[PDB]
């Protein structure tokens, strides 16, 4: 065994394109529409609960997730990828910030941490 | 032998009306031998002030460490760190060395730039926060400082009255401690001006 | 603690600091470290405060009994030896004493004996005892002459204690000066180190390392 | 330090004194010893103050993440299990002695935990240097089916016994009440029986009393434009 | 080893270091040079536990020389002393700490100023007009406190240093076999071969 | 601590006092020292409370995972898991555990695991500081194949004496009965057992 | 191993005025973290207008005071009822203390009264009998909290006259008995706040030419 | 220097309006072994004093013989031995305190903590403590060993200062003492259920109560307590 | 060592094992631990053999000189002499002695003097290393005013259990009966008491 | 104290003793005479624990002077050394022994012979041509073994002694501040005032 894939699966093509990122964006394009609007005294995020079956209880599937008491997230694309990102985002808000400064991270810095995790899946082996 | 009383020294901090004060002696020694009369124990990162008593090598190391961390904080946050936030950072940083600690007695002083509220805090060598409303003391003459502050202090002192109170608290405490003295500095801190005063005191 | 005594043309200068400490805590700044054994003899306090006080007062009583019996002033040699023989009896029990027995008689002239709790008894010209002794020796050794005037000798003793008071954490408070003549000792006042330091710094130009 | 926990009809109450000491010296006269693990799980700590704070915040952090992961409100038994396994691993070197209390979907709970990682169940508990004074009061006045008002009274009386009789305890009484189906109410300085009397004299100095060598403005602002 | 002294005068830094190397019962050497040139205008003297002193000093020397080659530039005395302090502060919490105390005498070519730094084995750094390690300060500081002036010439510094060594030779129980004296100024480092 | 487990005709009964001391202070006078590691496999704990709780929690985990894969474990298997933890970590543990359980094939079984981490299968076992005072009594009064009522009396009388003489033992006498019929908890108060 | 010594806490304070002297002490007696008594007198009238307190290990303290009171009695018997002067009492106490030099009374002793010129006098002793006449002396648990405050407020240390900026000291003007008692009360109130062994009550004995008077004040009981 | 072998635990006591109460259990422990169950640790001296002793029992028995000898000696050539020249509580205490301090000063202590409770000739309450170090103190409530930590807090709720003494009846005082003895039985591992209690009153004299028992104990709540955390059964 | 003395209707009986050990070696397996200090005042000895022999010899001397002057001493008097030696020399002695005697006025009496040198008059007493294991048994089985045969059985059964569990106890069970009729020695061998 | 040497030549005994008195950190004196004249033709040098050295030496001196007055006669060096040995042999089993080592240099007027005795604090006596106490012998005995002759003059003895002191000053870590040298011969005791 051992993970013997220690090389990048995303690489530059002759035209300078990173194929796997483009294809990931294509998967996002197929995803259900979600949106966000910023007001003076608040922000709203919204999406459609596209239920896969009417027997499914769509209230048990949360597309909009609390990351911190003052930060929320919504997505378009692959649901399972989102779910694990939410788990990592919630944890990193504690490990790399709240356990150090005794307060929750500002929006831009939590976004930065999530972005870093997504960048690494674009270069790591 | 006791690491917290090899070099000697003291820090005291007080709150007043729309102001804070932090003060320290200037002595560094090797037990009985006086080595330096210019060893300042108060540092600042933006508008947040940090006094550190105890083992001098750790005092220097921690100053460099908190300069390091507050500089990265500022680059990422795009703003200066506040006293309340910095207090947590000091606590976190000390407790990470729980079983091999820095032998220090840190003291935070400053005014929150948004609320304007005066803030002071103290720590033991392992990160426990003492957030007193009135005053914080630290060092080899902390008993003496507790005695001075408890009788001399009264709330809501004006900046120039607070200066006299904290100065007399430091001076008379230091004169009853063999390992403290050799000069003293007092910072008077207001929301957007800080004044630094070196005091004249006995040099034995 | 810093105590010194030195012989010179005009007799003996005795100079001491005034600080007593218990660990880092400064117990007193007003300790009398010169013990007036009688009007002609002085002893210095170092080591154990009680041991020095008690046994040097006792020495004064023995000196008084000697001169009542012999109708003659006791010699510094005899007086110092009464003390050294006494503490030698107690050797091992834990007495702590480092003292200079100082006197000026006809037969001896100005005489200083270093007496010590492990039984040592040394006659000498310059002695310095305490935690700040090394600092005071420096000033003494480089400025001492036999032909010092009483005025200059008094200042040298004062300046040497000040040197120790500055650097040694356990020395300070104030300086006590004595001048021992053949007709008895003369007290030359108490001098607060805080005020003395600034005065000496300005007048002498020394301590440029210190901002004043 | 005196800390107690008392079970009652529809919940649990914890209380603590407000004195923290180095040796014989009082470091802080109004210390906060009631720590929040989660909204309705609170605990009080005795022993090494940094350890009681740190272990609370670590488990409190992990409890919050666990609550988000499972979409369920945290349980006291989870906090207890995580605390004891952490403390046992460090073989008593983390000097945290805690009384852990709270309400959750399972009901109301009260546990004690020692620094080596041993745990206890009870209707009334006390910890710290004043625990014997507090337990004397608890053993004299505790009964089954206490009301909320009776439990608050008993808890604060037990802390008072510590305040007055134990030199390690003093100043004020802090209380936190956790009732089933309600918000936990934190009552900071519930009792204040130790206010210092007015001093005989004002020690405010005349301005210019202190001798000053130098004055200067400290630049706290960043490097300026132009 | 034993006595190391330093004095910063108007235009130079002077380091004096004893020559004796004693292994318990016998004095094995009486011409030992307890110093290393870190860069053309920076000198470091040292004292402490046997073996560790030279090992530490040569390790620092190798690092500063490496920096000089990489950047084609001489680090300031302040920068060198900070590097040395960090190494010792790192060392004190190691498995086996370096038991080494140092004095760093350098001439800053940018500021045109001499600089003397005193650093003990814990990583305790202070900039001083004059300094020492061990018991050396106990005998010499009262003399330096009295006579020192910031505008002293190199010759006056050497004369004050002689008075300090004389007091050491009088009151110290150990025979340290005299001192090697080196001067650090704008022209670099040189040894006073008659002292 | 006074603890014991006794096999009888219909199975096994575990018994224990409820006193936990820190020196001469009774830190808990109503302790439950009878511990469930599986439905019908329990244990009595003595020694370091931290250690015996840690061990018991790990055993309970092991037997829960065993049950999910291989079905109900034997009492011997439970004792073996206890022994493995106690023997391999003997340098860092102060634990004296009595393991008692009921199978339908094997019926009531008692295993004692003293300080060293050795295992001893016995008809009955006694342990804890208070046990020293009842070696004579228990040896003289134990019989094999007693009834439930006789075994309850034997344990009640035994622990009564252990409590009487040992300062480290006291409070209530707790008991857990393990048979084919199920699991029954019993409690006996001072006013009952002190007059025996 | 048997430890013949203990620590009963407590804090005492002696201040010498111009024609009076006060010796004050808290009334709390403790061992470890327990309170033995909230009112156990620690400052004693020993006759001949002398007041005494031996703070530290209370068994040695009681023994010393008892032996000194006895010494006063026999001084009267042996020397035609002559009044024992404060300086004579002080020298006598040195010999009582040094008599046990190698198994000391584990106490810090302070006596107060008037000298033979009618001026206020305070003497301070270490456990083995070294002594000195002093103007101001705190003893016991909270001595380190009290003395710096007294240096500042009795002797006006580090205080200079406004406008001169360090050139002229604040002049050492004499304090009245009412003024001294204020400083004593504030010293003990502050010590009570920050030291766990100080509290319950404060008893002050005031010595004048008219005799010995007592004053009692409550302190915080936590 | 020695070590205590057979030991007695707490002695507790307090003042009330007309006299004093003192109590101590009847156990003689041998380490953790509750060896001897009929040990009387309150020893009356005359009709005005009761001496309560904790610690080493062999030393207690020695002190008991000293007090017995003290009564014999006081009666010698003393026509008023049962009147004006009878032994006072203050005489008995001062004698014991002298012995205790002398013994510690020879580095050979009587390993005890002692409380002398009684009523003086003028009707004044006497209550004072002395131990192996010769340390003495007085207080409205006094207790030794565990009693100091657990009984005192309870007894001080009844008499918190001197002015509370005249407001405290003998019924309220005895009730408080008996409750404290129950609390000590719950929480002291070296205590027993059986104890003695003595009341010395200026009107009704010395009442010595033997073979008392701790009663009204709460244990029922123990039945609901299961496991040490997660266990439900 | 396992020793005991038990009062009964007609007087008192002393009992003891016969094992004396140096570590794990049995230096004497037929020791006589029941020692005569007067005609009808005997004692059981535990602790340092050197110390308890030295004490007993001095007591025997004291009671012999007492008898020559004042006639037969009481058992209380003998206990007092033992106590005086044990208490005053507590720092230098390791002795645990049970004193048993028969008067005609007082009948059977038992006094135990443990390590400290205190005295305790009891209906019966047990001491020595082996006694720890029979506190439970003896407390449950002792009755006042037993017959001679019952008391012999009580001691035989008690010491049997003490010997069974204590490695420091063993050999034969010796007994001495003290009544108005006189002094009777009894001995019981392993093959007798081991099967009880 | 520290170094005490002795050498017996043709017609005299020469004792060399260091001048330093060190109390831990500082050299308190540099002119101390570590010797006592017991009788006109007998000299004793000494080294050991502070206080005890002088106390013992003066006690011996008082006893020999008492004998001289009582009998109007000077005891032989052998007799004096035997008396001293017995005092030290008695002392070693005392409550607090004298920690004192001595050399006894005497000229026997009856035999017309110089005599040197070495006695340590245990009461170990040996008659030697040359001797020392402490570490002094470790540095000097190889030189004395080589150059010593029983027919040496006093001047040759002093020259060999100078070589011994030079080797001590080179290889010993401690500064003993030179030596006082005294000669014992038929005419009595005299001090060499330039050495
Ligand atoms: Cl076992
Ligand atoms: Cl026993
Ligand atoms: Mg100072
Ligand atoms: Mg100083
Ligand atoms: Mg463990
Ligand atoms: Mg029990
Ligand atoms: Mg307090």
Curated annotation (Swiss-Prot), chain A:
Instruction: Please provide the record's keywords in A-Z order.
Output: Cytoplasm, Isopeptide bond, Nucleus, Proteasome, Ubl conjugation
Q: Which terms does the UniProt entry file under GO BP?
A: proteasomal ubiquitin-independent protein catabolic process; proteasome-mediated ubiquitin-dependent protein catabolic process
Q: Which GO terms describe its cellular component?
A: nucleus; proteasome complex; proteasome core complex, alpha-subunit complex; proteasome storage granule
Claim: Lipid metabolism is one of the keywords in the record: no
**Superkingdom assignment:** Eukaryota
**UniProt signal peptide:** none
Tell me where in or outside the cell this protein is found.
Answer: Cytoplasm; Nucleus
Q: Where is this cross-link: Glycyl lysine isopeptide (Lys-Gly) (interchain with G-Cter in ubiquitin)?
A: 108
Q: How does it assemble?
A: The 26S proteasome consists of a 20S proteasome core and two 19S regulatory subunits. The 20S proteasome core is composed of 28 subunits that are arranged in four stacked rings, resulting in a barrel-shaped structure. The two end rings are each formed by seven alpha subunits, and the two central rings are each formed by seven beta subunits. The catalytic chamber with the active sites is on the inside of the barrel.
State the family named in the UniProt similarity comment for this chain.
Belongs to the peptidase T1A family.
Q: What else is known?
A: Present with 7060 molecules/cell in log phase SD medium.
Q: What is this protein called?
A: Proteasome subunit alpha type-2
The organism is: Saccharomyces cerevisiae (strain ATCC 204508 / S288c) (Baker's yeast)
- What gene is behind this protein? PRE8
Swiss-Prot record, chain C:
Q: Which GO terms describe its molecular function?
A: endopeptidase activity; threonine-type endopeptidase activity
Q: Other notes on this protein?
A: The side chain of Thr-1 acts as a nucleophile, and the N-terminal amino group acts as a proton acceptor.
Can you quote a single GO CC term?
A: proteasome core complex, beta-subunit complex
Where are the membrane-spanning stretches?
none
Q: How does it assemble?
A: The 26S proteasome consists of a 20S proteasome core and two 19S regulatory subunits. The 20S proteasome core is composed of 28 subunits that are arranged in four stacked rings, resulting in a barrel-shaped structure. The two end rings are each formed by seven alpha subunits, and the two central rings are each formed by seven beta subunits. The catalytic chamber with the active sites is on the inside of the barrel.
Q: Which GO terms describe its biological process?
A: proteasomal ubiquitin-independent protein catabolic process; proteasome core complex assembly; proteasome-mediated ubiquitin-dependent protein catabolic process
Active site (UniProt): 1 (nucleophile)
Subcellular location per UniProt equals:
Cytoplasm; Nucleus
Disulfide linkage: none
The entry's stated outcome for residue 51 to N is:
In DOA3-1; decrease in activity
* Keywords per UniProt: Cytoplasm, Hydrolase, Nucleus, Protease, Proteasome, Threonine protease, Zymogen
Gene source species: Saccharomyces cerevisiae (strain ATCC 204508 / S288c) (Baker's yeast)
Q: What is this protein called?
A: Proteasome subunit beta type-5
Name the protein family.
Belongs to the peptidase T1B family.
Give the binding site residues for bortezomib. Answer: 49
What is the E.C. number? 3.4.25.1
Where on the tree of life does the source sit, at the highest rank?
A: Eukaryota
Decide whether keyword Nucleus is in the record: yes
- Catalytic reaction(s) noted: Cleavage of peptide bonds with very broad specificity
UniProtKB/Swiss-Prot annotation, chains F, I:
Q: Name one GO biological process term.
A: proteasome-mediated ubiquitin-dependent protein catabolic process
Report keywords, A-Z.
Acetylation, Cytoplasm, Hydrolase, Nucleus, Protease, Proteasome, Threonine protease, Zymogen
**SUPFAM superfamilies, from UniProt?**
N-terminal nucleophile aminohydrolases (Ntn hydrolases)
At the top of the EC hierarchy, this enzyme's class is hydrolase
Cited PROSITE patterns? PROTEASOME_BETA_1, PROTEASOME_BETA_2
Give the superkingdom in one word: Eukaryota
Q: What residues sit in the active site? A: 1
* GO MF, one annotated term: endopeptidase activity
Its Enzyme Commission number? Answer: 3.4.25.1
Report which reactions are catalysed by this protein. Answer: Cleavage of peptide bonds with very broad specificity
Q: Where in the cell does this protein reside?
A: Cytoplasm; Nucleus
Q: Which CDD domains match?
A: proteasome_beta_type_6
User: Which terms in the GO cellular component ontology are assigned?
Assistant: cytosol; nucleus; proteasome complex; proteasome core complex, beta-subunit complex; proteasome storage granule
Q: Which PANTHER family match?
A: ATP-DEPENDENT PROTEASE SUBUNIT HSLV, METALLOPROTEASE TLDD
Q: How does it assemble?
A: The 26S proteasome consists of a 20S proteasome core and two 19S regulatory subunits. The 20S proteasome core is composed of 28 subunits that are arranged in four stacked rings, resulting in a barrel-shaped structure. The two end rings are each formed by seven alpha subunits, and the two central rings are each formed by seven beta subunits. The catalytic chamber with the active sites is on the inside of the barrel.
Additional detail: The side chain of Thr-1 acts as a nucleophile, and the N-terminal amino group acts as a proton acceptor. Present with 7250 molecules/cell in log phase SD medium.
Q: Which protein is depicted?
A: Proteasome subunit beta type-1
Tell me the lineage of the source organism. Answer: Eukaryota, Fungi, Dikarya, Ascomycota, Saccharomycotina
Write the gene name: PRE3
From Swiss-Prot, chain H:
Can you supply a Gene Ontology BP term from the record? proteasomal ubiquitin-independent protein catabolic process
Compartment(s)? Cytoplasm; Nucleus
Q: Name one Pfam family in it.
A: Proteasome
Task: Give the CDD domains listed for this entry.
Answer: proteasome_beta_type_4 (cd03760)
**What coarse category fits the chief subcellular location reported for this protein?**
cytoplasm
Q: Organism's domain of life? A: Eukaryota
Q: Name one GO cellular component term.
A: proteasome complex
Q: Which InterPro entries match?
A: Ntn_hydrolases_N, Proteasome_beta4, Proteasome_bsu_CS, Proteasome_sua/b, Proteasome_suB-type
The record's keywords, sorted A to Z, are: Cytoplasm, Nucleus, Proteasome
User: Gene3D superfamilies recorded for this chain?
Assistant: Glutamine Phosphoribosylpyrophosphate, subunit 1, domain 1
PANTHER family recorded: METALLOPROTEASE TLDD, PROTEASOME SUBUNIT BETA
Additional observations: Present with 16900 molecules/cell in log phase SD medium.
The protein's role, per its UniProt record: Non-catalytic component of the proteasome which degrades poly-ubiquitinated proteins in the cytoplasm and in the nucleus. It is essential for the regulated turnover of proteins and for the removal of misfolded proteins. The proteasome is a multicatalytic proteinase complex that is characterized by its ability to cleave peptides with Arg, Phe, Tyr, Leu, and Glu adjacent to the leaving group at neutral or slightly basic pH. It has an ATP-dependent proteolytic activity. PRE3 and PRE4 are necessary for the peptidyl-glutamyl-peptide-hydrolyzing activity.
Can you tell me which family this protein belongs to? Belongs to the peptidase T1B family.
Listed name of the protein: Proteasome subunit beta type-7
């Amino acid at each position: 065994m051992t993970d013997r894939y220690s090389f990048s699966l995303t690489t530059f093509s002759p035209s300078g394109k990173l194929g796997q990122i483009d294809y990931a964006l294509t998967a996002v394009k197929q995803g259900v529409t979600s949106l966000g609007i910023k007001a003076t005294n608040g922000v709203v995020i919204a999406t459609e609960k596209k239920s896969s079956s009417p027997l499914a209880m769509s209230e048990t599937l949360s597309k909009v997730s609390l990351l911190t008491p003052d930060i929320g997230a919504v997505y378009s694309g692959m649901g399972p990828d989102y779910r694990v990102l939410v788990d990592k985002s919630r944890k990193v808000a504690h490990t790399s910030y709240k356990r150090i400064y005794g307060e929750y991270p500002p929006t831009k810095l939590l976004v930065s941490e999530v972005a870093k995790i997504m960048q690494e899946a674009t270069q790591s082996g | 032998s006791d690491p917290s009383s090899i070099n000697g020294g003291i820090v005291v901090a007080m709150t007043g009306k729309d102001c804070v004060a932090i003060a320290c002696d200037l002595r560094l020694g090797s037990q009985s031998l006086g080595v330096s009369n210019k060893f300042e124990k108060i540092f600042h990162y933006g508008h947040v002030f940090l006094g550190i008593t105890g083992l001098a090598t750790d005092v220097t190391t921690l100053n460099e460490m908190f300069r390091y961390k507050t500089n990265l904080y500022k680059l990422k946050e795009e703003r200066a760190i506040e006293p309340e936030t910095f207090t947590q950072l000091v606590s976190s940083s000390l407790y990470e060395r729980r079983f091999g600690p820095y032998f220090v007695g840190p003291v935070v002083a400053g005014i929150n730039s948004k609320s304007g509220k005066p803030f002071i805090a103290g720590f033991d060598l392992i990160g426990c926060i003492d957030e007193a409303k009135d005053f914080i003391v630290s060092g080899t003459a902390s008993d003496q400082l507790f005695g001075m502050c408890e009788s001399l202090y009264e709330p809501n002192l004006e900046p120039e009255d607070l200066f006299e109170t904290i100065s007399q608290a430091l001076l008379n405490a230091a004169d009853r401690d063999a390992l403290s003295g050799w000069g003293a500095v007092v910072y008077i801190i207001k929301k957007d001006e800080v004044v630094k005063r070196y005091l004249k005191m006995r040099q034995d | 603690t810093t105590t010194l005594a030195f012989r010179f043309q005009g007799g003996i200068i005795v100079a001491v600091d005034s600080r007593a400490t218990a660990g880092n805590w400064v117990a007193s700044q007003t300790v009398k470290k010169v013990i007036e054994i009688n009007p002609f003899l002085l002893g210095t306090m170092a080591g154990g405060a009680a041991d020095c006080q008690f046994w040097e007062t006792w020495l004064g009583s023995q000196c008084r009994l000697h001169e009542l019996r012999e109708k003659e002033r006791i010699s510094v040699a005899a007086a110092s030896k009464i003390l050294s023989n006494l503490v030698y009896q107690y050797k091992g029990a834990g007495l702590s004493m480092g003292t200079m027995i100082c006197g000026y008689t006809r037969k001896e002239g100005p005489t200083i004996y270093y007496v010590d709790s492990d039984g040592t008894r040394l006659k000498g010209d310059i002695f310095c005892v305490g935690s700040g002794q090394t600092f005071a020796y420096g000033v003494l050794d480089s400025n001492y002459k036999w032909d010092l005037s009483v005025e200059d000798a008094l200042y040298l003793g004062k300046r040497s204690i000040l040197a120790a008071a500055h650097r040694d954490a356990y020395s300070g408070g104030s300086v006590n000066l004595y001048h021992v003549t053949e007709d008895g000792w003369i007290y030359h006042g108490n001098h607060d180190v805080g005020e003395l330091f600034w005065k000496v710094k300005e007048e002498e130009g020394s301590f440029n390392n210190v901002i004043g | 330090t005196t800390i107690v926990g008392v079970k009652f009809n529809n919940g649990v109450v914890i209380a603590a004194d407000t004195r923290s000491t180095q040796g014989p010296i009082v470091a802080d006269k109004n210390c906060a010893k009631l720590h929040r693990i989660s909204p309705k799980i609170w605990c009080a700590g005795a022993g090494t103050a940094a350890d009681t704070e740190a272990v609370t915040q670590l488990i409190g952090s992990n409890i919050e993440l666990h609550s988000l992961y499972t979409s369920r409100e945290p349980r006291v038994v989870s906090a207890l299990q995580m605390l004891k396994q952490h403390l046992f691993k460090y073989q008593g070197h983390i000097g945290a002695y805690l009384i852990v209390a709270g309400v959750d979907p399972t009901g109301s709970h009260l546990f004690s935990i020692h620094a080596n990682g041993s745990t206890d169940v009870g209707y009334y508990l006390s910890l710290g240097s004043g625990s014997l004074a507090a337990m004397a009061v608890l053993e004299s006045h505790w009964k089954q089916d206490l009301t909320k008002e009776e439990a608050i009274k008993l808890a604060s009386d037990a802390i008072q016994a510590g305040i007055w009789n134990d030199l390690g305890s003093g100043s004020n009484v802090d209380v936190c009440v956790m009732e089933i189906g309600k918000d936990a109410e934190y009552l900071r300085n519930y009792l204040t029986p130790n206010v210092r009397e007015e001093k005989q004299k004002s020690y405010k100095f005349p301005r210019g009393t202190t001798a000053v060598l130098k004055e200067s403005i400290v630049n706290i602002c960043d490097i300026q434009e132009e | 080893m034993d006595i190391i002294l330093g004095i910063r005068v108007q235009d130079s830094v002077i380091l004096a270091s004893s020559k004796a190397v004693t292994r318990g019962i016998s004095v094995l050497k009486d011409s030992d040079d307890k110093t290393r040139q870190l860069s053309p205008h920076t000198l470091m003297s040292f004292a402490g536990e046997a073996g560790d002193t030279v090992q530490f000093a040569e390790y620092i020397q190798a690092n500063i020389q490496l920096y000089s080659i990489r950047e084609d530039y001489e680090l300031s005395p302040q920068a060198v002393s900070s590097f040395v302090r960090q190494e010792l502060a790192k060392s004190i919490r190691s498995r086996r700490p370096y038991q080494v105390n140092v004095l760093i005498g350098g001439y800053d070519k940018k500021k045109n100023k001499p600089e003397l730094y005193q650093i003990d084995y814990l990583g305790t750094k202070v900039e001083l007009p004059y300094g020492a390690h061990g018991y050396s300060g106990f005998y010499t500081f009262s003399l330096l406190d009295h006579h020192y002036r910031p505008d002293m010439t190199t010759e006056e510094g050497l004369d004050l240093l002689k008075l300090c060594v004389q007091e050491l030779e009088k009151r110290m129980p150990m025979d340290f076999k005299g001192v090697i004296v080196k001067i650090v100024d704008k022209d670099g480092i040189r040894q006073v071969d008659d002292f | 601590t006074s603890i014991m487990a006794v096999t009888f005709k219909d199975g096994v009964i575990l018994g224990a006092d409820s006193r936990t001391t820190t020196g001469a202070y009774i830190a808990n006078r109503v302790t439950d020292k009878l511990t469930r590691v599986h439905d019908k496999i329990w244990c009595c704990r003595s020694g370091s409370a931290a250690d015996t709780q840690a061990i018991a929690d790990i055993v309970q985990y092991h037997l829960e995972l065993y049950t999910s894969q291989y079905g109900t474990p034997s009492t011997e298997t439970a004792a073996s898991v206890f022994k493995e933890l106690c023997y391999e970590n003997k340098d860092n543990l102060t634990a004296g555990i009595i393991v008692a359980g009921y199978d339908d094939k094997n019926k009531g079984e008692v295993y004692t695991i003293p300080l060293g981490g050795s295992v001893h299968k016995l008809p009955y076992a006694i342990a804890g500081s208070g046990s020293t005072f009842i070696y004579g009594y228990c040896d003289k009064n134990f019989r094999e194949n007693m009834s439930k009522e006789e075994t309850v009396d034997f344990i009640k009388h035994s622990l009564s004496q252990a409590i009487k003489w040992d300062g480290s033992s006291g409070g209530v006498i707790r008991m857990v009965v393990l048979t084919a019929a199920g699991v029954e908890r019993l409690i006996f108060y001072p006013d009952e057992y002190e007059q025996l | 191993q048997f430890n013949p010594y203990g620590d009963n806490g407590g804090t005492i304070l002696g201040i010498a005025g111009e024609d009076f002297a006060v010796l004050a002490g808290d009334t709390r007696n403790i061992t470890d973290y327990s309170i033995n008594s909230r009112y156990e007198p620690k400052v004693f009238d020993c006759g001949d207008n002398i007041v005494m307190s031996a703070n530290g290990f209370a068994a040695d303290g009681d023994a010393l005071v008892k032996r000194f009171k006895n010494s006063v009695k026999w001084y009267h018997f042996d020397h035609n009822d002559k009044k024992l002067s404060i300086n004579s009492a002080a020298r006598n106490i040195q010999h009582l203390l040094y008599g046990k030099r190698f198994f000391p009374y584990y106490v810090h002793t302070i006596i107060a009264g008037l000298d033979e010129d009618g001026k206020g006098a305070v003497y301070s002793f270490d456990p083995v009998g070294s002594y000195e006449r002093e103007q101001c002396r705190a003893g016991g648990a909270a001595a380190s909290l009290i003395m710096p405050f007294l240096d500042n407020q009795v002797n006006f240390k580090n205080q200079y006259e406004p406008g001169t900026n360090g050139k002229v000291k604040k002049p050492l003007k004499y304090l009245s008995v009412e003024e001294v008692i204020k400083l004593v009360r504030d010293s003990f109130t502050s010590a009570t706040e920050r030291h766990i062994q100080v509290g319950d009550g404060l008893e002050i004995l005031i010595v004048t030419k008219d005799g010995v008077r007592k004053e009692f004040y409550e302190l915080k009981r936590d | 220097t020695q070590q205590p072998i057979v030991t007695g635990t707490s002695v507790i006591s307090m003042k009330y309006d007309n006299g004093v109460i003192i109590a101590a259990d009847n156990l003689g422990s041998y380490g953790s072994l509750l060896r001897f169950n009929g040990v009387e640790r309150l020893i009356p001296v005359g009709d005005n004093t009761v001496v309560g002793i904790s610690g080493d029992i062999s030393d207690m028995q020695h002190i008991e013989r000293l007090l017995k000898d003290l009564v014999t000696e006081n009666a010698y050539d003393n026509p008023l031995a049962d009147a004006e020249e009878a032994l006072e509580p203050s005489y008995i205490f001062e004698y014991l305190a002298t012995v205790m301090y002398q013994r510690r000063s020879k580095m050979n202590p009587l390993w005890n903590a002692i409380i002398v409770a009684g009523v003086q000739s003028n009707g004044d309450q006497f209550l004072r403590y002395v131990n192996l170090l010769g340390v003495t103190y007085s207080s409205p409530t006094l207790a030794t060993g565990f009693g100091a930590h657990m009984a005192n807090p309870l007894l001080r709720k009844v008499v918190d200062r001197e002015s509370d003494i005249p407001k405290t009846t003998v019924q309220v005082a005895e009730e408080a003492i008996v409750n404290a003895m129950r609390v000590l039985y719950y929480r002291d591992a070296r205590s027993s259920r059986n104890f003695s209690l003595a009341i010395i009153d200026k009107n009704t004299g010395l009442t010595f109560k033997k073979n008392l028992q701790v009663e009204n104990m709460k244990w029922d709540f123990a039945k609901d307590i299961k496991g040490y955390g997660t266990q439900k059964i």
